[PDB]
Amino acid sequence: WVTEACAPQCPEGFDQPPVILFSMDGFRAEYLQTWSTLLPNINKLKTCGLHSKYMRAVYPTKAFPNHYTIVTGLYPESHGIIDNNMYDVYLNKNFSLSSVEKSNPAWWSGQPIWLTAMYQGLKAASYYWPGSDVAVNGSFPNIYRNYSNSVPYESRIATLLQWLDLPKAERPSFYTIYVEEPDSAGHKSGPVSAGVIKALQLVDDAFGMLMEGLKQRNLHNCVNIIVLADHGMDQTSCDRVEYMTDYFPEINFYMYQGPAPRIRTRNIPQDFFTFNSEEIVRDLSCRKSDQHFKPYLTPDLPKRLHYAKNVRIDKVHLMVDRQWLAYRNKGCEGGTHGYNNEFKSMEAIFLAHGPSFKEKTVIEPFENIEVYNLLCDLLHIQPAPNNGSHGSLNHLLKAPFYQPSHAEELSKSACGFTTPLPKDSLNCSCLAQEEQVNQRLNLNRGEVSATEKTNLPFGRPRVIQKNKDHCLLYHREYVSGFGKAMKMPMWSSYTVPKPGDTSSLPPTVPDCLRADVRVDPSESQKCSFYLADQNIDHGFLYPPAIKGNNESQYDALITSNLVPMYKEFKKMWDYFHKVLLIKYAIERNGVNVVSGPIFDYNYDGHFDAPDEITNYVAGTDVPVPTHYFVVLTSCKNKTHTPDSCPGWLDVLPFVVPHRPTNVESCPENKAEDLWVEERFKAHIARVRDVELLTGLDFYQEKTQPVSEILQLKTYLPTF
Ligand SMILES: Nc1ncnc2c1ncn2[C@@H]1O[C@H](COP(=O)(O)NP(=O)(O)OP(=O)(O)O)[C@@H](O)[C@H]1O
Ligand SMILES: *[C@@H]1O[C@H](CO)[C@@H](O[C@@H]2O[C@H](CO)[C@@H](O)[C@H](O)[C@H]2NC(C)=O)[C@H](O)[C@H]1NC(C)=O
Ligand SMILES: *[C@@H]1O[C@H](CO)[C@@H](O[C@@H]2O[C@H](CO)[C@@H](O)[C@H](O)[C@H]2NC(C)=O)[C@H](O)[C@H]1NC(C)=O
Ligand SMILES: *[C@@H]1O[C@H](CO)[C@@H](O[C@@H]2O[C@H](CO)[C@@H](O)[C@H](O)[C@H]2NC(C)=O)[C@H](O)[C@H]1NC(C)=O
Ligand SMILES: *[C@@H]1O[C@H](CO)[C@@H](O)[C@H](O)[C@H]1NC(C)=O
Ligand SMILES: [Ca+2]
Ligand SMILES: [Zn+2]
Ligand SMILES: [Zn+2]
């Protein structure tokens, strides 16, 4: 097989292609992009078959959360396995690799692929996998095997080939195989060592034994083999470790030491809920200028990670930088994993071979949460509710099983111009003159279609929320979707064109703010609402001084486009729309911005119901957003503008947390140009992430297949 050339070639007896999920622990993308030629069998698979540049892991980048994420399609917070070592309050038990509690079905949530196959009339066998040796939802896989890390790989492969020798009735359709290397060698020496090469050569022979075995069984060109990894590897040193003793006078708390630290109380389960978690982050927030970590609360963490809604995730969490560790006391060598999944060193591998997959194709990077949807499509089975976008991975397959469709709108738009005179002043006034700008808001059929072409190129974001009373408001420079109930816009779409050298930019008009004649005063936001609240003040979603002359910016300064913002948050919001937005408009040759509020007080990752919202503006029914999104959209080819682009798009979304203090960025000593960009970049999320938090599906009028649009939806930009 290793000497053979690139080729369904399935023989009689086998009617459907079998799926094998090969896992090589700690096999980073760096290993495949540098040492691939040293691996004869793996190099023959990357050339003939299909492979990605890298496969994005899930935080924390460890075996048990990632392996179980691949088989379920759920985030660690949803499937329960948030860490290899964790504690449950309600069950009052400790989960550990050495403990017997690993076999307890109460820890394991969701439905893995092997069970999904069994519930749909397909047998599933497994030779090692975190969860396969556990009775998830009562049932066990058809051929499960109790874990033993010291078993030789040749015997593991031999028994898997023996399962394929079984007759059609007893013969399983789905398989999984786990390998400890090149992870064990990564901890022993490091990611750039001779030790990992020997382990990489050892996994190559192990994969070689499977392909050579399948060759004599005439299944090497029939089997849909998927060789992937859980995480990557990063070098560590005893000099590159942050000690907690240098931050606290006395340690009276339990900490999960390593790349993903979690602070918990010792007295459990009584003092768990009453433990002052917000105190620890406050005592760790920018204590040193050369600090190698950042303390975070569960909802304060970047939304893209999806690591908050689970009782096992301790409220106080630590975000350690690249190559650096965190320990409780003074009492390391080689390498480790558990860091941010966005990091280059934590990028896993993905390689596939078979008749279902496209031959000699190098696909773009994707998240492990999507593997479950692909596995279901390969086995011809309906998936269980997972967090992966079904249909996103159709570009990998020659013949896609699931054809995705656009998200159905559950709420119809129904605001209209009648007279330019306002019924109620709403305690707001502009010093400037007669009401001439009020008639400019009133646009004819042609003028509406003009702004629905320039500022709305991919169409209006459809409301996926049930009974959401909303109205569409049109302006010459921006189109917005006002939310009648929350008295603020859900979204605001506007295409900023490519500007000149622009050394001096026009400033925003101060003290000028009028009332909207289209929106009814009962559903309108009053300026007196922010008068009583000293902490929160009126902020505009769409910046007025971004398009046109001094007269044109009068449309934004109205009761509409007004959203509640903190005085400290405005420093991040205004600087981004005055310096950064223009800077990235030059690089992309114009940019389409879709911005709005996010309500996620229950930190589940989904949009909040009116009852779910806990904080409102002082003595008013207008809510306060938890986060604010900014979706920047352009094109892959820089020659075209977002208003008129034929081809593939380029996206840069954000989920900026709406916090009363900039304690996350730490603005002390640093000028706005040194921390605003850094925070936005740290809070970059997928288009699917903004969609789930708002209940607004984007890009529905874009002339491209639903499968191709989902690739942009799942896309996460990495710098
Ligand atoms: N199904 C399983 N059941 C129990 N233990 C397993 C199973 N699969 C793998 N393991 C064990 O989990 C290890 C991989 O876990 P990890 O890579 O997540 N953690 P490790 O390398 O020990 O170091 P840390 O950075 O977490 O300190 C393997 O080497 C096995 O010993
Ligand atoms: C889980 O294991 C930890 C130890 O790893 C246990 O923590 C101890 O809990 C007692 C109170 O019950 C404290 O006084 C000790 O200080 C804790 N130990 C350490 C090392 O800090 C915990 O009780 C275990 N939980 C269960 C349910 O087994
Ligand atoms: C994996 O190990 C477990 C625990 O040793 C085995 O489970 C036992 O199975 C027998 C029947 O074979 C039952 O009578 C026991 O009650 C089970 N114990 C527990 C704690 O579940 C299991 O059979 C082993 N599986 C394999 C494939 O070796
Ligand atoms: C990931 O998917 C799961 C399943 O679709 C979601 O979990 C469900 O969420 C609803 C609403 O909160 C609950 O009523 C269900 O009980 C949950 N089920 C399970 C098994 O957890 C989860 O919210 C999704 N997460 C994201 C980020 O999309
Ligand atoms: C558990 O198994 C039963 C079998 O009847 C099934 O109906 C149910 O959906 C399963 N639940 C999960 C969470 O897999
Ligand atoms: Ca929510
Ligand atoms: Zn691992
Ligand atoms: Zn490991």
Author numbering: 140 to 146, 151 to 474, 478 to 560, 562 to 579, 585 to 871
Paper text:
All NPPs share a conserved zinc-binding catalytic domain (phosphodiesterase or PDE domain). NPPs hydrolyze pyrophosphate or phosphodiester bonds. Similar to NPP1 and NPP2, the structure of NPP3 consists of two major domains, which interact via a large interface of 1279 Å2.
A transfer of the crystals to 4 °C and ligand soaking with concentrations of 10–20 mM for 20–30 min finally lead to the observation of AMPNPP coordinated to the active center. Despite the somewhat limited resolution of 2.9 Å for this structure, the inhibitor is well defined by the electron density map. However, the nucleotide is positioned by ~0.7 Å closer to D276 such that the carboxylate group of this residue forms a direct hydrogen bond to the adenine amine group. Due to this shift, the α-phosphate group forms hydrogen bonds to the side chain of N227 and the backbone NH of T206 in addition to the Zn1-coordination. In the AMPNPP binding mode of NPP3, one of the free oxygen atoms is bound to Zn1 and the leaving group oxygen is not metal-coordinated.
